[PDB]
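Human: Here is a favour to ask of a fellow structure person. Comparing notes only helps if you start from a blank page. I am asking you to supply a protein in sequence and structure-token form. Write it directly below this note and I will take it from there.

Assistant:
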Amino acid sequence: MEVKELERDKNRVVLEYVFGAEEIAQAEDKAVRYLNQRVEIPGFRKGRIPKNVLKMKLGEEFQEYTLDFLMDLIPDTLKDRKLILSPIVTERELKDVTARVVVEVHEEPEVRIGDISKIEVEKVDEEKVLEKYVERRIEDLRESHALLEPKEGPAEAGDLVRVNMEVYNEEGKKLTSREYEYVISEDEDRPFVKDLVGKKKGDVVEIEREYEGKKYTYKLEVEEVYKRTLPEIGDELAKSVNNEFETLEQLKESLKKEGKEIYDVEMKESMREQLLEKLPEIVEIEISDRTLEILVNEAINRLKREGRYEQIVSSYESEEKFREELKERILDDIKRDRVIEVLAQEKGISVNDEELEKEAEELAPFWGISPDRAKSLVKARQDLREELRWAILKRKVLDLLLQEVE
């Protein structure tokens, strides 16, 4: 029983596991036990069929069983290695006084963080970002705070029409009701608003439009008309907060960096995702080309098992060329991941149950159940607590390398 690393191929070792005569026996009569309870031939009672006789029925078939119950001893050796792919047995052999097994062991590959500074992101102008958002938010704010009193006439340009909408099926059965508030302007027209210019309180319209499949009939009663002269950008707009605000500066000069709380995230996040995506360029790996082919073939044959293959491969250039093209994709994650993988522990980072929670709490809206139910889903399902672990871990690691483009 000697493990001889026959060969290494970067991050892929091949090992010769050899088993002397003593063990060859130990797995042989340990296969006659198992086989016997599978086998059934006249006379010989339940489990009691002598070894040779069994090896009589199987013969060359038997060799295999001896081998498997020697082959199970292999797993008890690569306990320490964290590998990309489950050990693959290239050849398994047995002769007179020897049972040889050749196992290929595809361990997770090594990487090398290059020049983390030599990486271009794209930081947008906080000032011009901020003023642009604010300008428009004053646009927004004076709208929803316009000076409105019910016009007694009709409805021309620039006036709010409160309309009560009812939706009926083609078969005349009301589906639901609603109320809306459309604002009109100069010579402008859009479905179910156009036909509602120069109408009064009480007056009705019945737009019959066809959607998706069936004919739908929309009853539109004008609930009220109101006059729409909005506050001009000043301190009279500071009525948005009833106490507090008294100057427009208090509105602007605030929002100018009130919505800085949004640039603080959307940007950080974008920056993060840029670096994440860009990461492979500075990262050298040593993956074996066999390890490439195998994960590549595994990716393709599963793309095959699903259906979304001939959708994608048969919509590019050829067949062999997508395989080449996918290979350049798989590698770059093998890259991105293992960079975080190391950098995580090698820069003192691990993801705890606590932050795992917060994460699933804001993820809950995205699954449709209670925020408290998500944690239960995390506690139950493993695949899911591991998926989140790695997801935060990434947030963190990328969150340092980026805060380090020096």
